[PDB]
Structures are given as C-alpha cells and as structure tokens.
C-alpha cells in the first residue's frame, strides 16, 4: 500500500538508523585522511565559504624581558575565502526489497549503501591528497612549496629511514618542529616492512604512519599534524539523503561537505 504512491519517507526510523550505523562504520574503517589531520568543527549545512589562510614566512616567536619584539603573523594582502565543495555518491534501493524486509521482519540489505559510502570516502581521500584541478582546489601533492626531498637509493634498510630523516631536517630548517604524520604509497609502505623499519618510522613520526591506495608510484608525505598548518572544514558530515523516486525504486545519496585548507604550505614535505 505504501509503495503505491511517491513516498516521502519510505524507510521508518529503524532502517534509517541501521543505514546510519552502516555508513558510519564503513566510512570509519575506510577513511585514511581524517586520521592524518584534525577536522574543523561542524559549521552547518548553510555555510559554503570559509577563509582560506596563507602564512608564508616564519615568525618563530620572541624572548624578551619587556615583550617589545611585537612579532605577529601577517594576514595575506587579500583573503581568498575558498568555497566548500561537496563529496557524494549514489545508490539504489529496490522497493520490493524494502517491502520484503518490512514483511519478513528481517534486517534490510544495505550492501549498495556500504559500497557507495566506501567509494565516497575514497573520493574524499583523493580530494585531500590531490587537487580537483577543475575546481581550483590545492592538494597535498599540488601545493606550492612542497619541500621536495630527492629519493635516491631506497631499498637498503638505512635509506628508507634516512629519507624520512632528511625530510624532517627540511621541516626543521623551514621552521616546523611539531609532531610528524607520514603517509605512504601502498608499494613502498608494504616494502618498508622488510627490516622492521616501519616501527622506527612510526616512532619518529609520533603520530602515525599510514598507507593510502590513492598515492601512485613512490609517494611519501610528512606533514606537521598541528592546527594552523592544515585543517579540514566540515560543513556537514557523512549522511544519507533521499533523492526522490524514479521507476518505483528509491535512489539515495551518501553525502558530505568537506574542504581541506592548507594554511601553511611549508608544513608538508613530499618525496
């Protein structure tokens, strides 16, 4: 009877919940980007633009008896106010499946939702680690002033740790001493486990050495985790929305509004 009309809320609160836990757990296991960087608090659905800050140059601070140095970061001559994109994916649910779940009193099948959420999280990781290049957004691998460190021999056990060291030294001379987070391509990430080197890299980082599929070829980035160097503005988190109905089925969209803003471009170091 309910499926005879274009239904407003086809699912009741039980399956809406079940969908919410499904998406939240799938994404939570899937995500590799959020772990690297702290999110900026939830602004809301209305917010679409946030102040994009740049802080080129270093003002490490002052020591004084009388506090007269007057040091203070300078705002960029023109605030750019970058806009917040939308990351989304779509999945179908069959009306016969919904009614079968309702009459059977059995859990509803949300495999399509889990797949859509995993793909949306993967696309989020792509946006974080690489710029859109059509929207004009700036990624970790496309940022100006990436502090490229050459990668010479890499398979001898000393070399892998040495390259991370040298990247740390570059960050040191550029002014960032904060905790380090290391993100590696799958190839060299798996390779690094040959000599137990991964634990040493993790200890040097002190915040986590993780692996991302999206990085292609050799790809290691060391990034000061701290706020005021990189941030993730969240307008609205992972949600599921109902895209009307067509052909009696029920399309839905896994949705999130994220923006990665690199406040200080010298806080990252690619290989």
């Amino acid at each position: 009877p309910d499926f005879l009309g274009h239904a407003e809320n086809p699912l009741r609160e039980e399956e809406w919940a079940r969908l919410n836990e499904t998406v939240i757990q799938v994404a939570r296991r899937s995500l590799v980007g959020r772990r690297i960087l702290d999110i900026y608090g939830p602004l809301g659905a209305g917010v679409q633009t946030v102040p994009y800050d740049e802080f080129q140059g270093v003002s490490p601070g002052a020591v004084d008896i009388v506090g007269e140095q007057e040091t203070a970061m300078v705002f960029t001559d023109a605030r750019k106010f970058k806009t917040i994109p939308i990351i989304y994916k779509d999945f179908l649910l069959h009306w016969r499946d919904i009614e079968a779940a309702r009459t059977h009193n059995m859990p509803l099948d949300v495999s399509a939702a889990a797949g859509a959420a995993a793909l949306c999280a993967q696309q989020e990781d792509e946006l974080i680690f690489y710029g859109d290049a059509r929207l004009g957004y700036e990624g970790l691998m496309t940022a100006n002033g990436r502090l490229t460190v050459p990668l010479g021999d890499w398979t001898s056990p000393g070399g892998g740790f040495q390259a991370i060291v040298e990247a740390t030294r570059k960050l040191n001379e550029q002014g960032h001493f904060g905790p380090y987070a290391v993100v590696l391509s799958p190839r060299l990430y798996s390779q690094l486990h040959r000599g137990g080197e991964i634990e040493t890299i993790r200890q040097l980082a002190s915040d986590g050495v993780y692996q991302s599929n999206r990085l292609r070829g050799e790809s290691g980035v060391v990034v000061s985790t701290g706020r005021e160097n990189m941030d993730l503005a969240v307008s609205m988190d992972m949600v599921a929305a109902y895209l009307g109905a067509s052909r009696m089925n029920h399309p839905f969209r896994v949705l999130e509004a994220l923006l990665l803003r690199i406040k200080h471009p010298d806080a990252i170091c690619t290989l």
Partner: peptide, 11 residues
C-alpha cells in the same frame, strides 16, 4: 538539534 558531527575524527 545541534550540529552533532557524525563520524568523529580519529585523532
């Protein structure tokens, strides 16, 4: 009725 971020940051 607040924002209530859903998937909390791992950090």
């Amino acid at each position: 009725p607040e924002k209530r971020l859903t998937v909390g940051s791992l950090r």
